[PDB]
A paper describes a structure:
The model of Csd2121–308 monomer accounting for residues His120–Asp301 was refined at 1.80 Å to Rwork and Rfree values of 18.1% and 21.8%, respectively. The Csd2121–308 monomer can be divided into two structural domains: the helical domain (residues His120–Gly139 and Asp259–Asp301) and the LytM domain (residues Met140–Leu258). The LytM domain of Csd2121–308 adopts the canonical fold, in which a central seven-stranded anti-parallel β-sheet (β1↑-β2↓-β9↑-β6↓-β5↑-β4↓-β7↑) forms a two-layered sandwich with a smaller anti-parallel β-sheet (β3↓-β8↑-β6↓). Unexpectedly, the Csd2121–308 monomer (referred to as chain A) in the asymmetric unit of the crystal forms a tight symmetric side-by-side homodimer with a neighboring Csd2121–308 monomer (chain A’) from an adjacent asymmetric unit. In this homodimer of Csd2121–308, a surface area of 1,550 Å2 per monomer is buried at the interface, as analyzed by the PISA server. The pair of helices α1 and α3 from one helical domain of Csd2121–308 pack against another pair of helices (α1’ and α3’) from the helical domain of another Csd2121–308 in the adjacent asymmetric unit to form a four-helix bundle through hydrophobic and hydrogen-bond interactions around a crystallographic two-fold symmetry axis. Numerous hydrophobic side chains are present at the interface, which are distributed in both the helix pair and the LytM domain (β4, β5-β6 loop, β6-β7 loop, β7-β8 loop, and β9-β10 loop). Two characteristic motifs (HxxxD and HxH) of the LytM domain are conserved in Csd1 and Csd3, whereas the first histidines of these motifs in Csd2 are substituted with Glu165 and Lys246, respectively. Despite the absence of a metal ion in the active site, the Csd2 LytM domain possesses a substrate-binding groove formed by four loops (Loop 1; β1-β2, Loop 2; β4-β5, Loop 3; β8-β9, and Loop 4; β9-β10) on the central β-sheet.
Residue numbers in the entry:
A (entry chain A), B (entry chain A): 120 to 301
Write the structure that this text describes.
Amino acid sequence: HLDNLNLAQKHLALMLIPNGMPIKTYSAIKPTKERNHPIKKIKGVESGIDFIAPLNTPVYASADGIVDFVKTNSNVGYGNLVRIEHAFGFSSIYTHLDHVNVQPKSFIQKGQLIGYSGKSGNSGGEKLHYEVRFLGKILDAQKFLAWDLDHFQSALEENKFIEWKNLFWVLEDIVQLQEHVD
Amino acid sequence: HLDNLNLAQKHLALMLIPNGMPIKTYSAIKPTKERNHPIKKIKGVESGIDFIAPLNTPVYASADGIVDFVKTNSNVGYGNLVRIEHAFGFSSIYTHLDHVNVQPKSFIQKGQLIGYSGKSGNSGGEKLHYEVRFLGKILDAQKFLAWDLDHFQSALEENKFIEWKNLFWVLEDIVQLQEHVD
Protein backbone atom coordinates (compact mmCIF):
# COMPACT_ATOMS: atom_id res chain seq x y z
CA HIS A 1 0.00 0.00 0.00
CA LEU A 2 2.95 2.42 0.60
CA ASP A 3 3.70 2.12 -3.14
CA ASN A 4 0.02 2.75 -4.14
CA LEU A 5 -1.04 5.72 -2.03
CA ASN A 6 -3.41 8.14 -3.74
CA LEU A 7 -2.70 11.86 -4.21
CA ALA A 8 -5.20 12.93 -1.55
CA GLN A 9 -3.27 10.84 1.06
CA LYS A 10 0.07 12.30 -0.12
CA HIS A 11 -1.15 15.91 0.00
CA LEU A 12 -2.67 15.43 3.46
CA ALA A 13 0.53 13.82 4.82
CA LEU A 14 2.58 16.76 3.47
CA MET A 15 0.33 19.30 5.25
CA LEU A 16 0.44 17.48 8.60
CA ILE A 17 3.96 15.98 8.91
CA PRO A 18 7.23 17.99 8.69
CA ASN A 19 8.64 18.17 5.19
CA GLY A 20 10.97 20.32 3.12
CA MET A 21 13.35 23.08 4.10
CA PRO A 22 12.53 25.43 7.04
CA ILE A 23 14.83 28.16 5.68
CA LYS A 24 15.30 29.47 2.09
CA THR A 25 18.91 30.56 2.28
CA TYR A 26 21.85 28.70 3.81
CA SER A 27 25.49 28.19 2.99
CA ALA A 28 25.82 24.67 4.46
CA ILE A 29 23.91 21.85 6.20
CA LYS A 30 25.70 19.76 8.82
CA PRO A 31 24.53 17.20 11.42
CA THR A 32 24.62 18.39 15.01
CA LYS A 33 26.39 15.06 15.79
CA GLU A 34 29.46 16.63 14.17
CA ARG A 35 29.69 19.60 16.59
CA ASN A 36 29.66 20.05 20.34
CA HIS A 37 26.01 19.43 21.23
CA PRO A 38 24.17 22.55 22.57
CA ILE A 39 23.46 20.81 25.95
CA LYS A 40 25.87 17.84 26.24
CA LYS A 41 28.83 19.79 24.78
CA ILE A 42 30.39 16.71 23.14
CA LYS A 43 30.43 15.40 19.60
CA GLY A 44 28.52 12.34 18.50
CA VAL A 45 25.02 13.03 19.83
CA GLU A 46 22.25 12.13 17.32
CA SER A 47 20.51 15.44 17.38
CA GLY A 48 19.22 16.86 14.12
CA ILE A 49 20.87 19.26 11.76
CA ASP A 50 22.26 22.75 11.50
CA PHE A 51 21.68 25.15 8.63
CA ILE A 52 24.63 27.52 8.45
CA ALA A 53 22.94 30.84 7.69
CA PRO A 54 23.47 34.52 8.45
CA LEU A 55 21.74 36.35 11.34
CA ASN A 56 18.10 37.27 10.68
CA THR A 57 17.31 34.69 8.04
CA PRO A 58 13.53 34.02 8.19
CA VAL A 59 12.55 30.58 9.53
CA TYR A 60 9.34 28.84 8.42
CA ALA A 61 7.12 26.08 9.89
CA SER A 62 7.63 22.74 8.09
CA ALA A 63 4.00 21.55 8.69
CA ASP A 64 0.66 22.54 10.19
CA GLY A 65 0.33 22.30 13.96
CA ILE A 66 0.40 24.22 17.22
CA VAL A 67 3.21 26.01 19.07
CA ASP A 68 3.68 24.24 22.38
CA PHE A 69 6.82 25.86 23.77
CA VAL A 70 9.02 28.91 23.12
CA LYS A 71 12.12 30.50 24.59
CA THR A 72 12.41 34.22 23.71
CA ASN A 73 15.22 35.70 25.83
CA SER A 74 17.71 32.91 26.36
CA ASN A 75 21.38 32.73 25.61
CA VAL A 76 22.13 29.24 26.99
CA GLY A 77 21.79 25.73 25.55
CA TYR A 78 19.44 25.75 22.52
CA GLY A 79 18.99 29.51 22.94
CA ASN A 80 15.82 31.10 21.64
CA LEU A 81 13.53 28.50 20.17
CA VAL A 82 10.12 27.42 18.92
CA ARG A 83 8.71 23.90 19.26
CA ILE A 84 5.76 22.94 17.08
CA GLU A 85 3.56 19.89 17.82
CA HIS A 86 2.21 18.28 14.68
CA ALA A 87 -0.37 15.53 14.17
CA PHE A 88 0.33 11.87 14.76
CA GLY A 89 3.18 12.37 17.20
CA PHE A 90 5.55 14.46 15.14
CA SER A 91 7.27 17.61 16.43
CA SER A 92 9.72 20.05 14.97
CA ILE A 93 12.08 22.36 16.79
CA TYR A 94 13.87 25.48 15.62
CA THR A 95 16.70 26.90 17.68
CA HIS A 96 19.46 29.42 18.18
CA LEU A 97 16.98 32.03 16.96
CA ASP A 98 17.52 35.78 17.13
CA HIS A 99 13.78 36.46 17.45
CA VAL A 100 10.60 34.43 17.91
CA ASN A 101 7.44 35.53 16.08
CA VAL A 102 4.84 33.11 17.41
CA GLN A 103 3.32 32.49 20.88
CA PRO A 104 2.57 29.23 22.72
CA LYS A 105 -0.94 27.91 21.93
CA SER A 106 -0.89 29.59 18.47
CA PHE A 107 -2.07 27.50 15.52
CA ILE A 108 0.45 27.17 12.76
CA GLN A 109 0.17 26.79 9.03
CA LYS A 110 2.87 25.06 6.99
CA GLY A 111 5.21 27.73 5.61
CA GLN A 112 4.27 30.33 8.13
CA LEU A 113 7.05 32.55 9.44
CA ILE A 114 7.94 31.58 13.00
CA GLY A 115 11.10 33.53 13.70
CA TYR A 116 14.46 34.78 12.51
CA SER A 117 17.71 32.86 12.68
CA GLY A 118 20.43 33.86 15.12
CA LYS A 119 23.37 32.59 17.15
CA SER A 120 21.72 32.42 20.60
CA GLY A 121 22.81 29.78 23.10
CA ASN A 122 25.56 27.24 22.53
CA SER A 123 25.30 27.69 18.77
CA GLY A 124 28.92 27.70 17.59
CA GLY A 125 27.99 30.63 15.32
CA GLU A 126 25.20 31.92 13.13
CA LYS A 127 22.95 28.97 12.25
CA LEU A 128 19.47 27.44 12.57
CA HIS A 129 19.35 24.20 14.56
CA TYR A 130 16.47 21.99 13.39
CA GLU A 131 15.11 18.68 14.70
CA VAL A 132 12.27 16.42 13.72
CA ARG A 133 11.07 13.98 16.38
CA PHE A 134 8.42 11.27 16.73
CA LEU A 135 6.97 11.04 20.29
CA GLY A 136 10.17 12.69 21.42
CA LYS A 137 12.43 10.36 19.52
CA ILE A 138 15.09 11.86 17.30
CA LEU A 139 14.80 11.12 13.57
CA ASP A 140 17.03 11.63 10.48
CA ALA A 141 15.93 15.14 9.53
CA GLN A 142 17.46 14.89 6.05
CA LYS A 143 14.84 12.30 5.16
CA PHE A 144 12.12 14.91 5.91
CA LEU A 145 13.96 17.76 4.14
CA ALA A 146 14.04 15.71 0.93
CA TRP A 147 10.41 14.54 1.26
CA ASP A 148 7.94 16.04 -1.23
CA LEU A 149 5.27 14.97 -3.77
CA ASP A 150 7.91 13.95 -6.39
CA HIS A 151 10.05 12.18 -3.75
CA PHE A 152 7.37 10.63 -1.58
CA GLN A 153 9.29 7.59 -0.38
CA SER A 154 11.97 9.67 1.33
CA ALA A 155 10.36 9.99 4.81
CA LEU A 156 8.79 6.52 4.53
CA GLU A 157 12.33 5.00 4.75
CA GLU A 158 12.47 6.30 8.33
CA ASN A 159 10.57 3.08 9.06
CA LYS A 160 12.22 1.46 12.06
CA PHE A 161 10.22 3.22 14.76
CA ILE A 162 7.22 4.61 12.74
CA GLU A 163 4.41 2.32 11.44
CA TRP A 164 3.81 4.25 8.23
CA LYS A 165 1.29 1.74 6.81
CA ASN A 166 -1.00 2.23 9.81
CA LEU A 167 -0.65 6.00 9.64
CA PHE A 168 -1.70 5.98 5.97
CA TRP A 169 -4.73 3.74 6.82
CA VAL A 170 -5.85 6.45 9.23
CA LEU A 171 -5.30 9.16 6.56
CA GLU A 172 -7.25 7.10 3.98
CA ASP A 173 -10.36 7.25 6.18
CA ILE A 174 -10.03 11.08 6.34
CA VAL A 175 -9.66 11.38 2.53
CA GLN A 176 -12.64 9.05 1.88
CA LEU A 177 -14.86 11.11 4.17
CA GLN A 178 -14.19 14.31 2.17
CA GLU A 179 -14.79 12.49 -1.16
CA HIS A 180 -18.18 11.34 0.25
CA VAL A 181 -18.97 14.99 1.27
CA ASP A 182 -17.98 16.46 -2.18
CA HIS B 1 -16.72 32.45 10.06
CA LEU B 2 -17.52 30.04 12.97
CA ASP B 3 -21.19 30.32 11.92
CA ASN B 4 -20.40 29.68 8.21
CA LEU B 5 -18.03 26.71 8.25
CA ASN B 6 -18.45 24.28 5.37
CA LEU B 7 -19.18 20.55 5.81
CA ALA B 8 -15.67 19.49 4.81
CA GLN B 9 -14.24 21.60 7.71
CA LYS B 10 -16.81 20.15 10.15
CA HIS B 11 -16.13 16.54 9.14
CA LEU B 12 -12.36 17.03 9.36
CA ALA B 13 -12.62 18.66 12.83
CA LEU B 14 -14.75 15.72 14.05
CA MET B 15 -12.13 13.18 12.88
CA LEU B 16 -9.20 15.03 14.50
CA ILE B 17 -10.54 16.54 17.76
CA PRO B 18 -12.22 14.54 20.58
CA ASN B 19 -15.98 14.35 20.24
CA GLY B 20 -18.88 12.19 21.37
CA MET B 21 -19.08 9.45 23.95
CA PRO B 22 -16.08 7.11 24.58
CA ILE B 23 -18.33 4.39 26.02
CA LYS B 24 -21.74 3.05 24.81
CA THR B 25 -23.21 1.98 28.12
CA TYR B 26 -23.20 3.86 31.42
CA SER B 27 -25.60 4.38 34.28
CA ALA B 28 -24.45 7.91 35.22
CA ILE B 29 -22.05 10.73 34.30
CA LYS B 30 -20.54 12.85 37.07
CA PRO B 31 -17.71 15.42 37.20
CA THR B 32 -14.55 14.25 38.94
CA LYS B 33 -14.68 17.59 40.84
CA GLU B 34 -17.52 16.02 42.84
CA ARG B 35 -15.46 13.07 44.17
CA ASN B 36 -12.11 12.64 45.86
CA HIS B 37 -9.65 13.26 43.02
CA PRO B 38 -7.60 10.13 42.01
CA ILE B 39 -4.28 11.90 42.92
CA LYS B 40 -5.14 14.87 45.17
CA LYS B 41 -7.78 12.93 47.15
CA ILE B 42 -9.96 16.00 47.77
CA LYS B 43 -13.13 17.29 46.18
CA GLY B 44 -13.25 20.34 43.96
CA VAL B 45 -10.47 19.64 41.46
CA GLU B 46 -11.43 20.52 37.84
CA SER B 47 -10.58 17.20 36.34
CA GLY B 48 -12.88 15.76 33.72
CA ILE B 49 -15.73 13.35 34.12
CA ASP B 50 -16.58 9.86 35.26
CA PHE B 51 -18.85 7.44 33.45
CA ILE B 52 -20.35 5.08 36.01
CA ALA B 53 -20.24 1.75 34.17
CA PRO B 54 -19.79 -1.93 35.02
CA LEU B 55 -16.43 -3.74 34.81
CA ASN B 56 -15.35 -4.68 31.28
CA THR B 57 -17.35 -2.12 29.35
CA PRO B 58 -15.48 -1.46 26.06
CA VAL B 59 -13.86 1.98 25.78
CA TYR B 60 -13.39 3.70 22.40
CA ALA B 61 -11.07 6.46 21.09
CA SER B 62 -12.92 9.79 20.69
CA ALA B 63 -10.74 10.97 17.73
CA ASP B 64 -7.87 9.98 15.45
CA GLY B 65 -4.36 10.24 16.87
CA ILE B 66 -1.49 8.34 18.45
CA VAL B 67 -1.12 6.58 21.80
CA ASP B 68 1.60 8.37 23.72
CA PHE B 69 1.41 6.77 27.16
CA VAL B 70 -0.16 3.72 28.84
CA LYS B 71 -0.27 2.16 32.28
CA THR B 72 -1.17 -1.56 32.15
CA ASN B 73 -0.56 -3.02 35.64
CA SER B 74 -1.24 -0.22 38.07
CA ASN B 75 -3.59 -0.04 40.99
CA VAL B 76 -2.71 3.47 42.27
CA GLY B 77 -3.86 6.97 41.28
CA TYR B 78 -5.47 6.92 37.81
CA GLY B 79 -4.88 3.16 37.63
CA ASN B 80 -4.58 1.55 34.22
CA LEU B 81 -4.85 4.13 31.49
CA VAL B 82 -4.41 5.19 27.88
CA ARG B 83 -3.48 8.70 26.76
CA ILE B 84 -4.07 9.64 23.14
CA GLU B 85 -2.42 12.69 21.50
CA HIS B 86 -4.60 14.27 18.86
CA ALA B 87 -3.89 17.01 16.31
CA PHE B 88 -3.69 20.68 17.18
CA GLY B 89 -2.82 20.20 20.83
CA PHE B 90 -5.73 18.11 22.01
CA SER B 91 -5.36 14.98 24.15
CA SER B 92 -7.77 12.53 25.68
CA ILE B 93 -7.22 10.25 28.62
CA TYR B 94 -9.07 7.13 29.70
CA THR B 95 -8.52 5.73 33.17
CA HIS B 96 -9.33 3.22 35.87
CA LEU B 97 -9.27 0.59 33.12
CA ASP B 98 -9.35 -3.16 33.70
CA HIS B 99 -7.35 -3.85 30.53
CA VAL B 100 -5.50 -1.82 27.89
CA ASN B 101 -5.68 -2.95 24.26
CA VAL B 102 -3.32 -0.53 22.53
CA GLN B 103 0.46 0.10 22.76
CA PRO B 104 2.43 3.37 22.92
CA LYS B 105 3.32 4.68 19.43
CA SER B 106 0.23 2.98 17.90
CA PHE B 107 -1.86 5.04 15.49
CA ILE B 108 -5.46 5.37 16.47
CA GLN B 109 -8.66 5.72 14.51
CA LYS B 110 -11.71 7.45 15.97
CA GLY B 111 -14.00 4.78 17.43
CA GLN B 112 -11.32 2.18 17.77
CA LEU B 113 -11.41 -0.01 20.86
CA ILE B 114 -8.66 0.98 23.27
CA GLY B 115 -9.47 -0.95 26.41
CA TYR B 116 -12.06 -2.19 28.86
CA SER B 117 -13.40 -0.26 31.81
CA GLY B 118 -12.47 -1.24 35.36
CA LYS B 119 -12.02 0.06 38.90
CA SER B 120 -8.20 0.25 39.00
CA GLY B 121 -6.48 2.91 41.10
CA ASN B 122 -8.26 5.45 43.27
CA SER B 123 -11.48 4.98 41.31
CA GLY B 124 -14.18 4.98 44.00
CA GLY B 125 -15.77 2.02 42.16
CA GLU B 126 -16.44 0.71 38.68
CA LYS B 127 -16.20 3.65 36.25
CA LEU B 128 -14.33 5.17 33.30
CA HIS B 129 -12.52 8.41 34.08
CA TYR B 130 -12.25 10.61 30.97
CA GLU B 131 -10.48 13.92 30.34
CA VAL B 132 -10.06 16.17 27.35
CA ARG B 133 -7.15 18.62 27.48
CA PHE B 134 -5.65 21.32 25.27
CA LEU B 135 -1.82 21.56 25.61
CA GLY B 136 -2.27 19.93 28.98
CA LYS B 137 -5.00 22.26 30.10
CA ILE B 138 -8.18 20.76 31.46
CA LEU B 139 -11.37 21.47 29.50
CA ASP B 140 -15.13 20.95 30.07
CA ALA B 141 -15.47 17.44 28.68
CA GLN B 142 -19.26 17.66 28.45
CA LYS B 143 -18.87 20.24 25.70
CA PHE B 144 -16.94 17.63 23.63
CA LEU B 145 -19.35 14.77 24.49
CA ALA B 146 -22.25 16.80 23.07
CA TRP B 147 -20.30 17.96 19.98
CA ASP B 148 -21.38 16.44 16.66
CA LEU B 149 -22.42 17.47 13.12
CA ASP B 150 -25.96 18.48 14.26
CA HIS B 151 -24.60 20.28 17.36
CA PHE B 152 -21.45 21.83 15.96
CA GLN B 153 -21.27 24.89 18.19
CA SER B 154 -20.97 22.84 21.37
CA ALA B 155 -17.14 22.53 21.54
CA LEU B 156 -16.68 25.99 19.99
CA GLU B 157 -18.11 27.53 23.23
CA GLU B 158 -14.98 26.25 25.00
CA ASN B 159 -13.48 29.46 23.62
CA LYS B 160 -11.58 31.12 26.45
CA PHE B 161 -8.25 29.36 25.92
CA ILE B 162 -8.67 27.95 22.34
CA GLU B 163 -8.55 30.22 19.23
CA TRP B 164 -11.13 28.27 17.24
CA LYS B 165 -11.24 30.76 14.33
CA ASN B 166 -7.53 30.28 13.67
CA LEU B 167 -7.83 26.51 13.93
CA PHE B 168 -10.61 26.50 11.31
CA TRP B 169 -8.48 28.73 8.99
CA VAL B 170 -5.81 26.04 9.11
CA LEU B 171 -8.42 23.32 8.41
CA GLU B 172 -9.83 25.35 5.48
CA ASP B 173 -6.46 25.20 3.72
CA ILE B 174 -6.45 21.37 4.11
CA VAL B 175 -10.01 21.05 2.70
CA GLN B 176 -9.23 23.36 -0.26
CA LEU B 177 -6.17 21.30 -1.17
CA GLN B 178 -8.24 18.10 -1.48
CA GLU B 179 -10.94 19.89 -3.55
CA HIS B 180 -8.14 21.04 -5.93
CA VAL B 181 -6.86 17.40 -6.13
CA ASP B 182 -10.37 15.91 -6.82
